[PDB]
Coordinates of C-alpha atoms in Angstrom, one line a residue:
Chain A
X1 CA 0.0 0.0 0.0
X2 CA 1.0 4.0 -0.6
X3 CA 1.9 5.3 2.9
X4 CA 1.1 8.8 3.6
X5 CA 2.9 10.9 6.4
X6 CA 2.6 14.5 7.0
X7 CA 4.4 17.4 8.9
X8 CA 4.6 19.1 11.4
X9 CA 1.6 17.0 13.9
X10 CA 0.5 20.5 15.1
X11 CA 1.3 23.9 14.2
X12 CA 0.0 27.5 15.5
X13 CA 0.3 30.6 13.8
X14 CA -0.8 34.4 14.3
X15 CA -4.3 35.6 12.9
X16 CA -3.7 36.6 9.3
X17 CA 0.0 34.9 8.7
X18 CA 0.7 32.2 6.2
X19 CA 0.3 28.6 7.0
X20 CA 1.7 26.1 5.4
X21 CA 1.7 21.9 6.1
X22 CA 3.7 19.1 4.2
X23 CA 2.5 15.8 2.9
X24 CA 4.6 12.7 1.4
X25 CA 3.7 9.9 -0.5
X26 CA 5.8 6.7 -0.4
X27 CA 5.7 6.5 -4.2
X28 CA 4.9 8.4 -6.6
X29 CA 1.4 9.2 -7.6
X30 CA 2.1 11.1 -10.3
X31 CA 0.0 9.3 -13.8
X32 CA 2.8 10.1 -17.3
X33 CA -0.3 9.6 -19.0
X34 CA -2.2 12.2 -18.5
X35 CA -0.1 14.3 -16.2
X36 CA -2.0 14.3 -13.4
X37 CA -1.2 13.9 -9.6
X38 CA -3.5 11.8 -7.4
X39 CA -3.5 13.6 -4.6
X40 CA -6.1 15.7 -2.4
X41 CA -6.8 17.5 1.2
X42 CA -9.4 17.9 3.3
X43 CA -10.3 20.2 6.3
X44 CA -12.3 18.5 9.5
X45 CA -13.8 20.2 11.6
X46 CA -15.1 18.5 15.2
X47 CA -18.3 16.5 14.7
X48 CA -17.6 17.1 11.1
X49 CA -17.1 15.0 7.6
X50 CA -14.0 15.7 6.1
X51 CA -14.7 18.4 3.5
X52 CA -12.2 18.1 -0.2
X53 CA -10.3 21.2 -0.6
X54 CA -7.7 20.3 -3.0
X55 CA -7.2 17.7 -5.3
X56 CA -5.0 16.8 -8.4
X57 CA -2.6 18.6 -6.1
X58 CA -3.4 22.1 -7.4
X59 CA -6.9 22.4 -8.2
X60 CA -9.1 24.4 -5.7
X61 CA -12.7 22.7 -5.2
X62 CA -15.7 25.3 -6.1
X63 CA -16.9 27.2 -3.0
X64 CA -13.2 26.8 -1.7
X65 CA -12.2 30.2 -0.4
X66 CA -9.1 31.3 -2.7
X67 CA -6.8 31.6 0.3
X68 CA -6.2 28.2 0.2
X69 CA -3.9 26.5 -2.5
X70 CA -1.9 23.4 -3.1
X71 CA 1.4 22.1 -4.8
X72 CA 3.6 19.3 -5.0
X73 CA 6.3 17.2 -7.2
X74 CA 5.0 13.1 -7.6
X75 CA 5.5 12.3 -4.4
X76 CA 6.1 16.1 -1.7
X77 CA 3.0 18.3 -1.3
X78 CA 2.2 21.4 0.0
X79 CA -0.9 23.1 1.5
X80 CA -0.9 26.6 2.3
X81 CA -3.0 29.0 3.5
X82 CA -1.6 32.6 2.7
X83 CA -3.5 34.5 5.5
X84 CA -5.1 32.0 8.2
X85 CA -8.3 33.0 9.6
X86 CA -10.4 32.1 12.8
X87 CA -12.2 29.9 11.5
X88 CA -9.9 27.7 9.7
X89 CA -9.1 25.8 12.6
X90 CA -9.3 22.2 12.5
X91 CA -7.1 19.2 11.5
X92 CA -6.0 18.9 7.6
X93 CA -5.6 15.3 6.0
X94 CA -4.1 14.4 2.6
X95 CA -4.9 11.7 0.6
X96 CA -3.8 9.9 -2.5
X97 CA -6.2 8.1 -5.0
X98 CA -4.1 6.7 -7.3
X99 CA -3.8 2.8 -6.3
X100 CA -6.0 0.7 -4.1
X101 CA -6.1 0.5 -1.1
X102 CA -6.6 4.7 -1.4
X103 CA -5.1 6.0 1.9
X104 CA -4.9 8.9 4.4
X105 CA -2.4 10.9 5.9
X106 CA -2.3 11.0 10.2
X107 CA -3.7 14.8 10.0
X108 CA -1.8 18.2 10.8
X109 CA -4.2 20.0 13.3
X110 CA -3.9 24.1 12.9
X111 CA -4.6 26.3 15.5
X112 CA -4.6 30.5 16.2
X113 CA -1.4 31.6 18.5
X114 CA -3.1 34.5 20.5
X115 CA -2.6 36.7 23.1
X116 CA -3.2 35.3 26.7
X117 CA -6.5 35.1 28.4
X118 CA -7.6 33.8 31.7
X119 CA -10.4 31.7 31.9
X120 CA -13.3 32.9 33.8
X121 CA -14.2 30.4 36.9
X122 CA -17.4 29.4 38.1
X123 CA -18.6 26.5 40.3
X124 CA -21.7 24.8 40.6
X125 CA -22.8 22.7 43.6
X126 CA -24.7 19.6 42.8
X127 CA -28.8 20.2 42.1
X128 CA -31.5 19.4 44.9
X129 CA -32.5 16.7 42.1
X130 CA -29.5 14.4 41.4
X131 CA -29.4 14.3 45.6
X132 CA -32.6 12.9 45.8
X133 CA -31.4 10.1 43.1
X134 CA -28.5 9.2 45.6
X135 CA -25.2 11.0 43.7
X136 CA -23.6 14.3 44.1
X137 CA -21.9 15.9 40.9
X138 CA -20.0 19.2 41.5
X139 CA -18.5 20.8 38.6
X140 CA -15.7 23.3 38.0
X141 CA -15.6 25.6 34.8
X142 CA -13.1 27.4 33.0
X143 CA -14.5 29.3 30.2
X144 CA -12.6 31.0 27.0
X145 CA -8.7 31.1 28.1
X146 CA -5.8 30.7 25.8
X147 CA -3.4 28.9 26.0
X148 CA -4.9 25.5 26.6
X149 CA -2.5 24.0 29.7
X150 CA -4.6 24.3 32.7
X151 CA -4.9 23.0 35.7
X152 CA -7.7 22.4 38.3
X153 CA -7.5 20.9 41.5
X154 CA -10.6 19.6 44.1
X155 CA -10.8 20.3 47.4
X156 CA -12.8 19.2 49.9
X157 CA -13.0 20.7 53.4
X158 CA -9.2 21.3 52.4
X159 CA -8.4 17.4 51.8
X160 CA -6.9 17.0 47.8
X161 CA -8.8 14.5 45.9
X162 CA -7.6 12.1 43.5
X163 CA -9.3 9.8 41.2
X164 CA -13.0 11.0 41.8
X165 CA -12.9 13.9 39.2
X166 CA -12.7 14.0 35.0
X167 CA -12.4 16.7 32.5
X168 CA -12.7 17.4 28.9
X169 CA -11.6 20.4 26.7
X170 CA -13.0 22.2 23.9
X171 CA -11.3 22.6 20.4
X172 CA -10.1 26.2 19.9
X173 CA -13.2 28.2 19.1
X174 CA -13.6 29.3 15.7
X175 CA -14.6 33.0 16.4
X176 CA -12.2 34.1 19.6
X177 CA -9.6 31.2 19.8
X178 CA -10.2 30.6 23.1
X179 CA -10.7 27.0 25.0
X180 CA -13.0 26.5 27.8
X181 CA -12.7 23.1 30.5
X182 CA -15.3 21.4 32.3
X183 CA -14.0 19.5 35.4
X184 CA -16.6 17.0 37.2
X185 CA -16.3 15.7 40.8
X186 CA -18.7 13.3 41.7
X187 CA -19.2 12.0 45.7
X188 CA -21.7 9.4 46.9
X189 CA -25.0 11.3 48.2
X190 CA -23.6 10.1 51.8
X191 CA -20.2 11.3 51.3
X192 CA -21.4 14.6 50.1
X193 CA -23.2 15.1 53.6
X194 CA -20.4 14.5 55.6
X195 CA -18.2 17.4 54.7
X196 CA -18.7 21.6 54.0
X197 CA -16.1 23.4 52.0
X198 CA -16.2 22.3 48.1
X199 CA -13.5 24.5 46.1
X200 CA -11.8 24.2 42.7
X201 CA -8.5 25.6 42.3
X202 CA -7.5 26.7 38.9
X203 CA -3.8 27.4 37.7
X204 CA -3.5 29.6 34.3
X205 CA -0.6 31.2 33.1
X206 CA -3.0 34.2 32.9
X207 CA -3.4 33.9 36.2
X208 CA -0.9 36.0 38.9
X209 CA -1.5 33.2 41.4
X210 CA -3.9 30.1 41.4
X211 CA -7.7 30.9 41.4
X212 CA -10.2 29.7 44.0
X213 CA -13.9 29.0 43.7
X214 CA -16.0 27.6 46.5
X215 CA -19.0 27.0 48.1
X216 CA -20.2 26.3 52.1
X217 CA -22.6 23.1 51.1
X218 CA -26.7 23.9 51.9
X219 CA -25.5 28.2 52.4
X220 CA -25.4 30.9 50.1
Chain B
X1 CA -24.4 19.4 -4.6
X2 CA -25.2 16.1 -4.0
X3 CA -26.3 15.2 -0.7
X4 CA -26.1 11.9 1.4
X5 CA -28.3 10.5 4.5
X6 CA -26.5 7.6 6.6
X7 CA -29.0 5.8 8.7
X8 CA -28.7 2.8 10.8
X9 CA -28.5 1.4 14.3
X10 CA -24.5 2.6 16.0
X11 CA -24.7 -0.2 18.3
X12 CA -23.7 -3.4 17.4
X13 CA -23.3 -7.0 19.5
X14 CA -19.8 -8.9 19.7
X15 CA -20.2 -11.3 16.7
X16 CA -23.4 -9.9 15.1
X17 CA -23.4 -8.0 11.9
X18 CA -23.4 -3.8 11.2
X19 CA -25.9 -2.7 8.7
X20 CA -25.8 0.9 7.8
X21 CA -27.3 2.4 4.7
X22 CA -26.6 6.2 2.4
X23 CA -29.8 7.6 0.8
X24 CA -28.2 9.4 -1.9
X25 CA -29.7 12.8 -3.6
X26 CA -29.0 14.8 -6.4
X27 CA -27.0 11.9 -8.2
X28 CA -27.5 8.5 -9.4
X29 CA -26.2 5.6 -7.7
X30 CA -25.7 3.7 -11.1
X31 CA -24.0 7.1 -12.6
X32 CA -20.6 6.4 -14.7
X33 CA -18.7 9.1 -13.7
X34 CA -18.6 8.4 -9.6
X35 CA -18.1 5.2 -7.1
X36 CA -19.8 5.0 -3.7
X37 CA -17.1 4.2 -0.9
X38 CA -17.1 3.8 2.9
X39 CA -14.8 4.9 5.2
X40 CA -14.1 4.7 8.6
X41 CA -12.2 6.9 10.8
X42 CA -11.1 6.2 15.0
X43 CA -8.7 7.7 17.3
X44 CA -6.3 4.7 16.9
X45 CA -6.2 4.4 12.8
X46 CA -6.7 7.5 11.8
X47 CA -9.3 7.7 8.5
X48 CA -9.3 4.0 6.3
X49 CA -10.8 3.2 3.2
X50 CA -13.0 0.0 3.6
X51 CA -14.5 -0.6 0.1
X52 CA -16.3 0.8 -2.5
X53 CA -19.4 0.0 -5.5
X54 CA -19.6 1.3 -9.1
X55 CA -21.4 0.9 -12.0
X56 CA -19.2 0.7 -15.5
X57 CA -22.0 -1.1 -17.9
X58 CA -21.7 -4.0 -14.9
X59 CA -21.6 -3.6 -10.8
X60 CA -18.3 -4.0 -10.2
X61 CA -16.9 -3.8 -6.5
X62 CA -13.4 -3.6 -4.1
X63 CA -13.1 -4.3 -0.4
X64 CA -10.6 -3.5 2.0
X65 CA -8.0 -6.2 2.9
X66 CA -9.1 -6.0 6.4
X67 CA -12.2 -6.8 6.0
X68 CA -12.2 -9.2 2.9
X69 CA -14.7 -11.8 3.5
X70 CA -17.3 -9.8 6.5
X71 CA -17.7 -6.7 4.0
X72 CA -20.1 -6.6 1.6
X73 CA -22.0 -3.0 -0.6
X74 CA -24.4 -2.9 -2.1
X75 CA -26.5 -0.4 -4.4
X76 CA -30.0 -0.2 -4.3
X77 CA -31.1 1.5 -7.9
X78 CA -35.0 1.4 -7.0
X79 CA -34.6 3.2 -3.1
X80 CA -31.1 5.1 -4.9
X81 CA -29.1 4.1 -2.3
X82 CA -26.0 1.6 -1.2
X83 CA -25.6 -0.2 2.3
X84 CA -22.5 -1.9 4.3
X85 CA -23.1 -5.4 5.8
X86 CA -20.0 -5.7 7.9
X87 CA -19.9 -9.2 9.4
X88 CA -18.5 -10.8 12.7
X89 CA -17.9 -7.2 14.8
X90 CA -15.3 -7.2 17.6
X91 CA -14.5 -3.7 19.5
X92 CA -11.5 -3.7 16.8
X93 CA -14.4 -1.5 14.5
X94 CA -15.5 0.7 16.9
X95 CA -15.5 3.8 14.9
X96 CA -17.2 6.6 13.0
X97 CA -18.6 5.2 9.4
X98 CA -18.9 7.5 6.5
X99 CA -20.3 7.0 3.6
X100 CA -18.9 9.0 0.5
X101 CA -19.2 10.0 -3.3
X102 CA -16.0 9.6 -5.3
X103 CA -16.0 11.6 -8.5
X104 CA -14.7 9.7 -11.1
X105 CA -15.1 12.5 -14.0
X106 CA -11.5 12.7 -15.8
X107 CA -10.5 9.7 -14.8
X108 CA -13.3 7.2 -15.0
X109 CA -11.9 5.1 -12.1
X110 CA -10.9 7.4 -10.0
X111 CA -10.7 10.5 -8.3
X112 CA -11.4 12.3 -4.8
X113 CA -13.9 12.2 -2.0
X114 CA -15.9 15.3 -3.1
X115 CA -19.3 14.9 -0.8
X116 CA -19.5 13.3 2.4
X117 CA -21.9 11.1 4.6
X118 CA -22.6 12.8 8.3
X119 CA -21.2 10.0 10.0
X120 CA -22.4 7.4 12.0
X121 CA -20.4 6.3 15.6
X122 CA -20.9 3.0 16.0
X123 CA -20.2 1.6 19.1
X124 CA -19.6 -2.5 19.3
X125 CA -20.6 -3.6 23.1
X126 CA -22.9 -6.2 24.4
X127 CA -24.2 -3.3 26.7
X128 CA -27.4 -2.3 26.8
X129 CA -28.7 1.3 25.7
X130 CA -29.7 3.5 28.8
X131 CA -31.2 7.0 28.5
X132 CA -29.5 10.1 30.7
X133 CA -30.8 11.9 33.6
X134 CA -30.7 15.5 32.8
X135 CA -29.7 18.0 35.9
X136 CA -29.7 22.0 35.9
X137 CA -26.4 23.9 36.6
X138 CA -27.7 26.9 38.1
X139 CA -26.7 30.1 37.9
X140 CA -26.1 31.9 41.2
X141 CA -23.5 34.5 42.2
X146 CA -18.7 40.7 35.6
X147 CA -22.4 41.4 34.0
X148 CA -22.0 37.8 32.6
X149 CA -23.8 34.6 34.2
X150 CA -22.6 30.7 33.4
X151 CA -25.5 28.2 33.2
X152 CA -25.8 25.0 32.0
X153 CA -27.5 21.5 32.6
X154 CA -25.3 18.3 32.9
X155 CA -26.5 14.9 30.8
X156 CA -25.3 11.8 32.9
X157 CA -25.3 8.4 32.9
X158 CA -26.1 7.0 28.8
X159 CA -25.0 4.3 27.0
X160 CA -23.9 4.6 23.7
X161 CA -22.6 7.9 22.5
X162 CA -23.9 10.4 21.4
X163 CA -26.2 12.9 22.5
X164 CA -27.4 16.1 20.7
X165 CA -28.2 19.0 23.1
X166 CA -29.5 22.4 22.2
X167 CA -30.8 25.6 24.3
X168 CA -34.3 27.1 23.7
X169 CA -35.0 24.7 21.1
X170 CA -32.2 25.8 19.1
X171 CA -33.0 29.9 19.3
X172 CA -29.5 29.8 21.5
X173 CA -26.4 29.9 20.2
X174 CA -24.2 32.7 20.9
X175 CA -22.0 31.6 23.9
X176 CA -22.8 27.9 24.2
X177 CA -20.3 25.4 25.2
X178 CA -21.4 21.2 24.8
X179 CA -18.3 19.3 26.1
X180 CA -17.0 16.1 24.8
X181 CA -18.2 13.4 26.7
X182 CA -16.5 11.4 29.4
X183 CA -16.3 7.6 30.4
X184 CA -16.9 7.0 34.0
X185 CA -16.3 3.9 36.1
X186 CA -19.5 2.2 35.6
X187 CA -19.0 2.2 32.2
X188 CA -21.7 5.1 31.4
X189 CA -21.2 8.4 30.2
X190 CA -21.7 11.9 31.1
X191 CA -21.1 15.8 29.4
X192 CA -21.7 19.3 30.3
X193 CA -23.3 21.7 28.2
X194 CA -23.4 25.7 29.1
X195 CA -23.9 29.0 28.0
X196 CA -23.2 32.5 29.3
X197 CA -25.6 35.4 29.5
X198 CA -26.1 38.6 30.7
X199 CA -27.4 38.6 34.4
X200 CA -29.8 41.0 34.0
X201 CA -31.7 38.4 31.9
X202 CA -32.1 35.9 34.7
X203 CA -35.1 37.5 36.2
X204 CA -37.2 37.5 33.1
X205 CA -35.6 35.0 30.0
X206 CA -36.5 31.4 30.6
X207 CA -33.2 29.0 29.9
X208 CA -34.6 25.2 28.4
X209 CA -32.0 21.9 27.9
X210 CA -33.1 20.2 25.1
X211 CA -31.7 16.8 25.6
X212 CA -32.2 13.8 22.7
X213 CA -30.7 10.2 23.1
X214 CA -31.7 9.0 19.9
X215 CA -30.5 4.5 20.6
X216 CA -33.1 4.9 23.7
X217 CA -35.6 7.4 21.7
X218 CA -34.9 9.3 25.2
X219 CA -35.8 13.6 24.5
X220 CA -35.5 15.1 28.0
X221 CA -36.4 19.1 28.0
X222 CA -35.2 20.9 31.3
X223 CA -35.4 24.2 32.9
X224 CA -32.5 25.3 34.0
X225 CA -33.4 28.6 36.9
X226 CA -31.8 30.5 39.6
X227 CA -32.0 28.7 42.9
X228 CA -33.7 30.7 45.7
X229 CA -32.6 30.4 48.9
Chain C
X2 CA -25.7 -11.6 -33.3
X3 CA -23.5 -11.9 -36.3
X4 CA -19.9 -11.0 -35.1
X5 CA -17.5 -13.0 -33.3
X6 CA -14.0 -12.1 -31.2
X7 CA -10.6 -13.7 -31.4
X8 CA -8.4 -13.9 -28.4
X9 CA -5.3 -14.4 -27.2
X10 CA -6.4 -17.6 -26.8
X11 CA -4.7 -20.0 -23.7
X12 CA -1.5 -18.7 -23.1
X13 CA 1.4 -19.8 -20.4
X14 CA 4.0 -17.2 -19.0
X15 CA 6.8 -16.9 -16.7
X16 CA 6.2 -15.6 -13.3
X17 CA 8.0 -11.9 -13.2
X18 CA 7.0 -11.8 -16.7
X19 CA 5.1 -9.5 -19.0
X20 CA 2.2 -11.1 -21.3
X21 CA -0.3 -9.1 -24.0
X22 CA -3.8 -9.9 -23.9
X23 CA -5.7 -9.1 -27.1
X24 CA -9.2 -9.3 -28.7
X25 CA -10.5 -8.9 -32.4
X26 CA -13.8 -8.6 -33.1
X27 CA -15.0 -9.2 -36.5
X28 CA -17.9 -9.7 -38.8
X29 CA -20.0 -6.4 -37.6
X30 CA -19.9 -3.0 -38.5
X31 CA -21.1 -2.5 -35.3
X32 CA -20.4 1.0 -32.9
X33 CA -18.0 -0.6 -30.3
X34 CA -19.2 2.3 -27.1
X35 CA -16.5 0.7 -24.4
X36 CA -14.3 -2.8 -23.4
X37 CA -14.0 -3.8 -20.0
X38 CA -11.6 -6.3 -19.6
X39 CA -11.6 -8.2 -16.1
X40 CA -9.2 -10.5 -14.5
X41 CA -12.0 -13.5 -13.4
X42 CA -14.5 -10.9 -11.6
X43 CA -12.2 -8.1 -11.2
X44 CA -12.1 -4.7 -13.5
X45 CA -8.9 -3.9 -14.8
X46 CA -9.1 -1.2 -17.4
X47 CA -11.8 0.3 -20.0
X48 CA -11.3 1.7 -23.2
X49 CA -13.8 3.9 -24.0
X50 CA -14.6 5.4 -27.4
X51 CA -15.2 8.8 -27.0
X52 CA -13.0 9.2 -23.6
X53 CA -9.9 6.8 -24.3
X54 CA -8.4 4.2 -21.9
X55 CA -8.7 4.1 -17.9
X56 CA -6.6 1.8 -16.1
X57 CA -8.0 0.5 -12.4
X58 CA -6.1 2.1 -9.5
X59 CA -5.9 -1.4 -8.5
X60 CA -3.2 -2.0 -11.6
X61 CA -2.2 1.3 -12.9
X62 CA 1.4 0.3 -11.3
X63 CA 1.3 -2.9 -13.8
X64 CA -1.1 -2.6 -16.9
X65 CA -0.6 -0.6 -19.1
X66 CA -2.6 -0.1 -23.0
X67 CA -1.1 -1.7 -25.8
X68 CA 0.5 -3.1 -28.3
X69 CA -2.4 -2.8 -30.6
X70 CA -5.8 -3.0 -29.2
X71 CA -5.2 -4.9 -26.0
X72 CA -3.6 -4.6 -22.7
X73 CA 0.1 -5.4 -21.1
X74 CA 0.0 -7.1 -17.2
X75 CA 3.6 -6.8 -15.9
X76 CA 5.4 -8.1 -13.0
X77 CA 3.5 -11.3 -13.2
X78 CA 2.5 -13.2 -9.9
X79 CA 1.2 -16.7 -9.6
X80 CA -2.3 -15.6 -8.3
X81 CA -2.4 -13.7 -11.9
X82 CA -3.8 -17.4 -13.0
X83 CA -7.1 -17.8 -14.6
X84 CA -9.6 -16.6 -16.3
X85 CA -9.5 -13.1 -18.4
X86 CA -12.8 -11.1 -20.2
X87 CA -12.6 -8.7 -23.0
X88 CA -16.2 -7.3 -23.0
X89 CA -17.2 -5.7 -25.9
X90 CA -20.6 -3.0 -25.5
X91 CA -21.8 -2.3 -29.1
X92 CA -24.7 -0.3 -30.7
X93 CA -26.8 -2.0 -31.8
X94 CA -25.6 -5.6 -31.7
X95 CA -25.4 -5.9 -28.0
X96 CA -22.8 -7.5 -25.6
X97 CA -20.1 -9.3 -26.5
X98 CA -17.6 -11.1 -24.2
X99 CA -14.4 -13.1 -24.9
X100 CA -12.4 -15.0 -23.2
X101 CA -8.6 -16.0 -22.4
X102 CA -7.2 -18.1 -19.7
X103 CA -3.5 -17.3 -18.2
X104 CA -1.8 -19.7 -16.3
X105 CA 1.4 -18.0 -14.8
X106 CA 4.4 -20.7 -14.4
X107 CA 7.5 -20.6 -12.6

């Protein structure tokens, strides 16, 4: 089979600079015939089909905004996009189609290098109506920061906790190129009663010093 | 542009067989200049070609090596549609399944993905499907307010959530789920808004579970103390 | 139904080898719209009247058009035995379809 690898895994560049990602094939899928090269890229977006941008190597699909473009000998190709906007962050695939089995490249993902933003931290304590079912969910959340490292830490009544909590991340968002983080600890009913002080410490490199949020369970 | 409607069931039984199906528009599924293909795509492998049906005077098909002998496509002309029959599942093809148009119009057998199925996850497990519970994240104490509801405890993937059935947008945030211990899952989904709003705008979760026909709408309102 | 194709007939080659696989179809003034020829159930190429030859990306590496009006398979490997279909679509005689078995040595 034709092997496909691509470079660089990851790249991040400022709004409105050039981007540009490499593909190679391990042969050539260039056809003497008829001159052609049997190559194309995509754009993915999460929760998203792939979506052709390029194929024949050079040849920009209709409703393709002209910013993007493609080039390459039989067997090293280029994408490029000249001026790289919000919301052409996602992960970029190339492909050739020139002999069976047709196969992909592992992806390049492209994201927007901004200027630093804290996230903004709110808590919220479990609802009256997942008590009642016998399970206590308190969640922590960072919303719109850049960069993406973060870290949030649980504690309750001043005790650290490990292996009760779990997280997940956003992709970059395609307007403000910010992330946001949801954090989940979740305690047996029982265990919930027993203590007072829930709090969520957050470390940001927009942030002077690690961030707080709590709450004094059944008090406002 | 043509378009492309995957249905079919995501969760399939160790051992038993994955049937999905692409309604195709706007093109004809016996047309000589394109081939209908399906593709899969997971976090280990990356996007892989499994196989593909065309019509060049005769039906002529190709199949992935790995999964020769469990794969078979085929095109309905009358419904204008093709289906994959994959054969003997193990958690090896967990994975999203696309269905896909190749456009075969300089050269006749072969060219690129130009149109694209929406993708079905499919999820091989001999669990059963379980609805979520769906609980409020309340807002309470700069002008801005965080809200949201949290969708726990389903089985398979995925949910769809929406806020004010669908009227809100701006500002929304639905998290990728997570696996927990007992082998369910659970997401958050919020959205910020202007405090000043709280006392008057009404905030709805529209939840839907579609492999346990689960729709869940909740209200999501300051708590009073 | 009043034409008829010659083949290449049975032919034996060498494993690594090249062979040519040809058809002839005579005895019709018939339009010829497209071949398909096929190892056993397989396409391998067409040759289309108004837009030329296509070669499968499953052989485009190792078949290549010509001499004449047939088809060169290079590289040669043992499962390359068997059966072979030149499939001639004509207006307004029909279908025609000949045949040539390859049996690849060593």
């Amino acid at each position: 089979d034709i092997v496909m690898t691509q470079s660089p895994d990851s790249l991040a560049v400022s709004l409105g600079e050039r981007a540009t990602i490499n593909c190679k094939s391990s042969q050539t899928v260039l056809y003497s015939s008829n001159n052609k090269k049997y190559l194309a890229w995509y754009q993915q977006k999460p929760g998203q089909p792939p979506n052709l941008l390029i194929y024949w190597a050079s040849t920009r699909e209709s409703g393709v905004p002209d910013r993007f473009s493609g080039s390459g000998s039989g067997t090293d190709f280029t994408l490029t996009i000249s001026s790289l906007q919000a919301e052409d962050v996602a992960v970029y695939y190339c492909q050739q189609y020139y002999s069976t089995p047709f196969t992909f490249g592992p992806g390049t993902k492209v994201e927007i290098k901004r200027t630093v933003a804290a996230p903004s931290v709110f808590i919220f304590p479990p609802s009256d109506e997942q008590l009642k079912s016998g399970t206590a969910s308190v969640v922590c959340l960072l919303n719109n920061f850049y960069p993406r490292e973060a870290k949030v830490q649980w504690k309750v009544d001043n005790a650290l906790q490990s292996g009760n909590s779990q997280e997940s991340v956003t992709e970059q968002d395609s307007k403000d190129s910010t992330y946001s983080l949801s954090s989940t600890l979740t305690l047996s009913k029982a265990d919930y009663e027993k203590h007072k002080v829930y709090a969520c410490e957050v470390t940001h490199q927009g942030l002077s010093s690690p961030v707080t949020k709590s709450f004094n369970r059944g008090e406002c | 542009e043509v378009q492309l409607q995957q249905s079919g069931p995501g969760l399939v039984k160790p051992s038993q067989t994955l049937s999905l199906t692409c309604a195709i528009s706007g093109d004809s599924v016996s047309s000589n200049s394109a081939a209908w293909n399906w593709i899969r795509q997971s976090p280990s492998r990356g996007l892989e070609w499994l196989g593909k049906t065309y019509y060049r005077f005769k039906w002529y098909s190709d199949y992935a090596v790995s999964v020769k002998g469990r794969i078979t496509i085929n095109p309905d002309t009358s419904k204008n549609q093709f289906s994959l029959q994959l054969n003997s599942v193990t958690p090896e093809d967990t994975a999203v399944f696309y269905c896909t148009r190749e456009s075969t119009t300089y050269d006749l057998l072969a060219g690129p993905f130009d149109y694209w199925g929406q993708g079905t996850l499919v999820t091989v497990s001999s669990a059963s499907t379980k609805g979520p519970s769906v609980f409020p994240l309340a807002p309470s104490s700069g002008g801005t307010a965080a809200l949201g509801c949290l969708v726990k405890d389903y089985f398979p993937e995925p949910v769809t959530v929406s806020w004010n059935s669908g009227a809100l947008t701006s500002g929304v945030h639905t998290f990728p789920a997570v696996l927990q211990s007992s082998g369910l899952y659970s997401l958050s989904s919020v959205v910020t808004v202007p405090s000043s709003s709280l006392g008057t705008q009404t905030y709805i979760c529209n939840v839907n579970h579609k492999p346990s026909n689960t729709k869940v709408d909740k209200k999501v309102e300051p708590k009073s103390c | 139904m009043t034409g008829t194709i010659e083949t290449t007939g049975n032919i034996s080659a060498e494993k690594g080898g090249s062979i040519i696989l040809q058809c002839h179809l005579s005895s019709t003034t018939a339009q010829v719209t497209q071949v398909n020829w096929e190892q056993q159930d397989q396409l391998l190429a067409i040759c289309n009247a108004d837009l030329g030859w296509h070669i499968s990306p499953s052989f485009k590496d190792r078949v290549a058009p010509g001499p004449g009006l047939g088809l060169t398979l290079q590289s040669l490997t043992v499962n390359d035995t068997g059966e072979y279909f030149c499939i001639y679509h004509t207006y307004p005689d029909g279908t025609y379809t000949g045949r040539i078995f390859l049996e690849v040595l060593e």
